[PDB]
Amino acid sequence: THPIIHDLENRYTSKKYDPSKKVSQEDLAVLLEALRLSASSINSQPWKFIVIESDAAKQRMHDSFANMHQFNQPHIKACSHVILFANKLSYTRDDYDVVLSKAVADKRITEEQKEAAFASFKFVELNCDENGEHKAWTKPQAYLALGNALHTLARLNIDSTTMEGIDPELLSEIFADELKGYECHVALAIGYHHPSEDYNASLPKSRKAFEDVITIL
Amino acid sequence: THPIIHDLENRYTSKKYDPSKKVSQEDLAVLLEALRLSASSINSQPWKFIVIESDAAKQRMHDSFANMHQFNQPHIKACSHVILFANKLSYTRDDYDVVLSKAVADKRITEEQKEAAFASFKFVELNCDENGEHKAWTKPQAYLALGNALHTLARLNIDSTTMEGIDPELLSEIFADELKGYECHVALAIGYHHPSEDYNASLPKSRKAFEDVITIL
Numbered sequence: 528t529h530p531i532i533h534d535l536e537n538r539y540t541s542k543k544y545d546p547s548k549k550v551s552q553e554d555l556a557v558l559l560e561a562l563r564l565s566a567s568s569i570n571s572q573p574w575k576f577i578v579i580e581s582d583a584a585k586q587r588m589h590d591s592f593a594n595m596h597q598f599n600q601p602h603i604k605a606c607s608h609v610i611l612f613a614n615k616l617s618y619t620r621d622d623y624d625v626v627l628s629k630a631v632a633d634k635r636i637t638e639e640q641k642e643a644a645f646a647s648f649k650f651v652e653l654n655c656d657e658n659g660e661h662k663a664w665t666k667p668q669a670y671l672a673l674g675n676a677l678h679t680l681a682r683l684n685i686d687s688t689t690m691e692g693i694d695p696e697l698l699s700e701i702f703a704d705e706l707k708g709y710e711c712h713v714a715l716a717i718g719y720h721h722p723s724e725d726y727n728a729s730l731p732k733s734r735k736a737f738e739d740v741i742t743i744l
Numbered sequence: 745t746h747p748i749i750h751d752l753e754n755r756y757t758s759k760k761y762d763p764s765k766k767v768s769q770e771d772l773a774v775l776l777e778a779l780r781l782s783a784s785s786i787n788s789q790p791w792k793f794i795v796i797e798s799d800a801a802k803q804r805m806h807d808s809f810a811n812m813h814q815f816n817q818p819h820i821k822a823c824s825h826v827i828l829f830a831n832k833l834s835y836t837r838d839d840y841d842v843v844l845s846k847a848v849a850d851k852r853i854t855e856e857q858k859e860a861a862f863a864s865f866k867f868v869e870l871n872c873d874e875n876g877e878h879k880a881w882t883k884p885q886a887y888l889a890l891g892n893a894l895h896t897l898a899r900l901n902i903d904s905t906t907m908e909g910i911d912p913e914l915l916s917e918i919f920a921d922e923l924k925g926y927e928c929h930v931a932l933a934i935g936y937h938h939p940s941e942d943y944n945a946s947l948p949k950s951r952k953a954f955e956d957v958i959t960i961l
């Protein structure tokens with residue numbers, strides 16, 4: 528099988544973890560750097576990836592399922608790490624300056640061209656919603672990073688469970704300081720599936736027929 | 745360098761294509777199958793990938809830049825193929841029926857279980873607009889597929905240019921029948937960069953400091 532297809536046909540959504548296997552620091556570092564290298568509109572990187580690693584952090588995450596989507600709760604303490612994909616509520620010219628400044632430092636643009644580079648920010652200004660927030664534009668960038676992450680995990684042979692069945696309001700309360708100026712609509716548990724109780728590991732993958740999703744013109 | 749990091753450090757946004765090189769059908773088939781295998785919330789697959797391959801289709805795509813984002817227009821005819829990432833405006837039970845029916849046909853589930861599988865559709869009603877549109881939920885799923893595609897292209901060593909600088913309104917007119925019931929906010933040109941005029945090929949990649957985007961708890 529072609530290596531790319533093999534990876535995408537073999538990755539799946541784990542439904543039960545093995546609490547005695549942890550992701551190595553070597554593998555976790557690759558995943559985190561892969562997330563950092565994700566592409567985004569105008570190199571905005573309007574995101575923050577929060578890694579729930581410690582027992583104390585896991586308890587806090589565990590508690591965010593207090594009143595909603597409890598079918599996802601058992602994974603928190605059983606898996607190795609949980610990653611929160613946070614997207615910025617509003618993206619300002621100041622946030623953008625952080626990017627442009629770094630670009631001047633990395634030698635991709637000149638300080639003179641920097642001011643000239645601020646014109647690409649108009650693209651952000653046009654995507655400003657009712658309340659003056661850009662969350663409808665920043666959230667999709669974070670999902671792009673998530674797609675990158677899922678492909679990355681398939682290559683490292685690490686199991687995962689993407690989760691939209693979370694409580695964003697309660698997460699913003701529990702991780703108050705960390706999610707300041709951001710929102711979190713999706714989290715990702717990673718680890719190693721349970722050898723006998725992860726029933727999804729044995730089910731066939733199902734997707735729509737090629738002609739139902741692809742059109743060639 | 746670690747294979748995953750090498751791929752992500754070496755892929756970049758091409759700013760000029762070589763019109764004499766096309767993507768092979770073998771490579772195109774891998775990319776399209778990779779898009780099809782993308783994960784999505786509840787396996788909804790609320791997307792359609794439209795491939796602009798023929799000269800006639802390229803002309804239509806070329807014409808969608810008549811009003812705006814002219815800086816992106818030259819790539820259309822120069823590159824090999826353009827892929828439109830379309831997301832569904834509203835996701836219904838009939839839409840989910842198609843997913844569940846294919847799941848049954850894929851032996852993933854049984855007809856009896858197909859009836860109980862619709863209980864997962866409750867999560868789609870949770871993203872219904874005041875207008876009844878789920879575009880704020882479907883668009884992020886399409887961006888996840890895009891993140892998957894960008895990683896896939898890095899593995900195949902094919903150049904690309906993601907494009908949000910497009911005209912969704914003009915696209916809806918030009919690709920009237922193909923996009924009925926969908927919207928398209930991002931397209932992707934693929935091909936091979938111009939050997940000497942693609943200036944971005946020689947510029948360093950720039951991303952925010954690890955500490956600025958990643959928090960470990």
Ligand SMILES: Cc1cc2nc3c(=O)[nH]c(=O)nc-3n(C[C@H](O)[C@H](O)[C@H](O)COP(=O)(O)O)c2cc1C
Pocket residue numbers: 538539540599688689690691692693713732782783784785786787888
């Ligand atoms: C954005 C997103 C959110 C999802 N949320 C959940 C979730 O809350 N719980 C879980 O069990 N699975 C969740 N999934 C898993 C999907 O059901 C799964 O990706 C889809 O059925 C395709 O199956 P595979 O992932 O097994 O290929 C989610 C997936 C995506 C991409």
Ligand SMILES: Cc1cc2nc3c(=O)[nH]c(=O)nc-3n(C[C@H](O)[C@H](O)[C@H](O)COP(=O)(O)O)c2cc1C
Pocket residue numbers: 565566567568569570671755756757816905906907908909910930949
């Ligand atoms: C969603 C999205 C839309 C983008 N739109 C454009 C576009 O219209 N034109 C183009 O030249 N670059 C576009 N880019 C490219 C980004 O500027 C580029 O990904 C970011 O600067 C990081 O650089 P790299 O992609 O070279 O790593 C887009 C990227 C993303 C992910």
Ligand SMILES: O=c1cc(O)c2ccccc2o1
Pocket residue numbers: 567568569570647650907908909
């Ligand atoms: O030069 C660019 C680069 C971008 O990332 C971009 C994004 C959205 C709109 C237009 C754009 O123009």
Ligand SMILES: O=c1cc(O)c2ccccc2o1
Pocket residue numbers: 690691692784785786787864867
């Ligand atoms: O069983 C599932 C599968 C999903 O993909 C999902 C998505 C969002 C909310 C809850 C969910 O529960």
